C-alpha cells in the first residue's frame, strides 16, 4: 500500500476510459444501439429522429 | 396437391335421432365447401354450399359447421327419406387434384 | 376474413421486382420496415396470410 | 356491389409478417452473392449485417 497514488491514478484512467468505451452500446431509447442496424431497419424520415 | 377423407363411412340411427359426417382437409380450404346428395338410380343434388348456407328447396333439417380443416353436416331430424350417399367438395383449389370430391357415406335409416 | 389462411416460408430466396404483373394496382404501405431496401434483407420466419 | 365505388368492391391483402434477425437466416433477398477476401478493407454484408 506504499504506492497507492500513482496506482490510483492509473487505475482512474484506465476506468474512465473502459467506461466511455462500454457506454458506446448503450441504447438511449432506441430501437436499436447499432446505427447499421437502424439504417437497414427504417426509412430515413424517422431515421433522422433515432 | 389436395386431398380429403370423408367418415364415417356408413351411420345407422332410428328416425327420432340425429346423423353427423365429418368431412377433413389436409390442409385448410376456408368456407369454400360443398355437401352433394345422390339417391341410387339418381343423380346427386347439391344440399349444403359455402358449408353453410342452405340450398335451394331443401328443408330446413340439414346442418353444416366448421372452417378452414373441419367440416360437419349434422340432420336436426331423419325421415326415413334422407338414406343416400353424401359427398363434400373442396370447390377451393383443383389445379392438379385426382378428386374434387372426398368419400362416400351412405346412411342407412331402420324405421 | 374470418377463415383467413396461414402459410409458412422458409428455404427459399424473397424477390419482390417480381410483385408488379400479378398483383397490378397493389399498396405496399407497410410498418416496420423500409420497403425501399429490402432487396439486402434476410427473414428467420416469414408468414403469408 | 360493382357500381357503387372501390368501398363496395372485393380487396385481395395479403399480409406479410417477418422477425429480421441476422443469425438463423433462411429467406433472404434476391442480391447474388460474392467471394469473400481475406487481409483487406472492404465493406462486407453478411446476412444483411452490415
Given at each position: 500500500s506504499a504506492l497507492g497514488k500513482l496506482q490510483d491514478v492509473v487505475n482512474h484512467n484506465a476506468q474512465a476510459l473502459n467506461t466511455l468505451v462500454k457506454?458506446?452500446?448503450?441504447?438511449?431509447?432506441?430501437?436499436?444501439?447499432?446505427l447499421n442496424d437502424i439504417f437497414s431497419r427504417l426509412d430515413p424520415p424517422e431515421a433522422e429522429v433515432q | 396437391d389436395i386431398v380429403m377423407t370423408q367418415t364415417p363411412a356408413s351411420v345407422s340411427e332410428p328416425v327420432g335421432g340425429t346423423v353427423t359426417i365429418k368431412c377433413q382437409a389436409s390442409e385448410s380450404i376456408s368456407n369454400w365447401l360443398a355437401w352433394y346428395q345422390q339417391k341410387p338410380g339418381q343423380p346427386p343434388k347439391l344440399l349444403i354450399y359455402a358449408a353453410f348456407t342452405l340450398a335451394s328447396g331443401?328443408?330446413?333439417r340439414f346442418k353444416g359447421s366448421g372452417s378452414g380443416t373441419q367440416f360437419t353436416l349434422t340432420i336436426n331430424g331423419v325421415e326415413c327419406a334422407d338414406a343416400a350417399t353424401y359427398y363434400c367438395q373442396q370447390?377451393?383449389?383443383?389445379?392438379?387434384?385426382?378428386?374434387?370430391f372426398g368419400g362416400g357415406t351412405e346412411v342407412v335409416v331402420k324405421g | 376474413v374470418y377463415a383467413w389462411n396461414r402459410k409458412r416460408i422458409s428455404n427459399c430466396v424473397a424477390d419482390?421486382?417480381?410483385?408488379?404483373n400479378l398483383a397490378?394496382?397493389?399498396?405496399?404501405?407497410?410498418?416496420?420496415?423500409?420497403?425501399?431496401?429490402?432487396?439486402?434483407l434476410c427473414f428467420t420466419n416469414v408468414y403469408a396470410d | 356491389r360493382p357500381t357503387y365505388g372501390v368501398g363496395h368492391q372485393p380487396y385481395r391483402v395479403v399480409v406479410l409478417s417477418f422477425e429480421?434477425?441476422?443469425?438463423?437466416?433462411?429467406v433472404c433477398g434476391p442480391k447474388k452473392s460474392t467471394n469473400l477476401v481475406k487481409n483487406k478493407c472492404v465493406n462486407f454484408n453478411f446476412n444483411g449485417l452490415k
Amino acid at each position: 500500500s506504499a504506492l497507492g497514488k500513482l496506482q490510483d491514478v492509473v487505475n482512474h484512467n484506465a476506468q474512465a476510459l473502459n467506461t466511455l468505451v462500454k457506454q458506446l452500446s448503450s441504447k438511449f431509447g432506441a430501437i436499436s444501439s447499432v446505427l447499421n442496424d437502424i439504417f437497414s431497419r427504417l426509412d430515413p424520415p424517422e431515421a433522422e429522429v433515432q | 396437391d389436395i386431398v380429403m377423407t370423408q367418415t364415417p363411412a356408413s351411420v345407422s340411427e332410428p328416425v327420432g335421432g340425429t346423423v353427423t359426417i365429418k368431412c377433413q382437409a389436409s390442409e385448410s380450404i376456408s368456407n369454400w365447401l360443398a355437401w352433394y346428395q345422390q339417391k341410387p338410380g339418381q343423380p346427386p343434388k347439391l344440399l349444403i354450399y359455402a358449408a353453410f348456407t342452405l340450398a335451394s328447396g331443401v328443408p330446413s333439417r340439414f346442418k353444416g359447421s366448421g372452417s378452414g380443416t373441419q367440416f360437419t353436416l349434422t340432420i336436426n331430424g331423419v325421415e326415413c327419406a334422407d338414406a343416400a350417399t353424401y359427398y363434400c367438395q373442396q370447390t377451393y383449389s383443383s389445379r392438379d387434384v385426382d378428386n374434387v370430391f372426398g368419400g362416400g357415406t351412405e346412411v342407412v335409416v331402420k324405421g | 376474413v374470418y377463415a383467413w389462411n396461414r402459410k409458412r416460408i422458409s428455404n427459399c430466396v424473397a424477390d419482390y421486382s417480381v410483385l408488379y404483373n400479378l398483383a397490378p394496382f397493389f399498396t405496399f404501405k407497410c410498418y416496420g420496415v423500409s420497403p425501399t431496401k429490402l432487396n439486402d434483407l434476410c427473414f428467420t420466419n416469414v408468414y403469408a396470410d | 356491389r360493382p357500381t357503387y365505388g372501390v368501398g363496395h368492391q372485393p380487396y385481395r391483402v395479403v399480409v406479410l409478417s417477418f422477425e429480421l434477425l441476422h443469425a438463423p437466416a433462411t429467406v433472404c433477398g434476391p442480391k447474388k452473392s460474392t467471394n469473400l477476401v481475406k487481409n483487406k478493407c472492404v465493406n462486407f454484408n453478411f446476412n444483411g449485417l452490415k
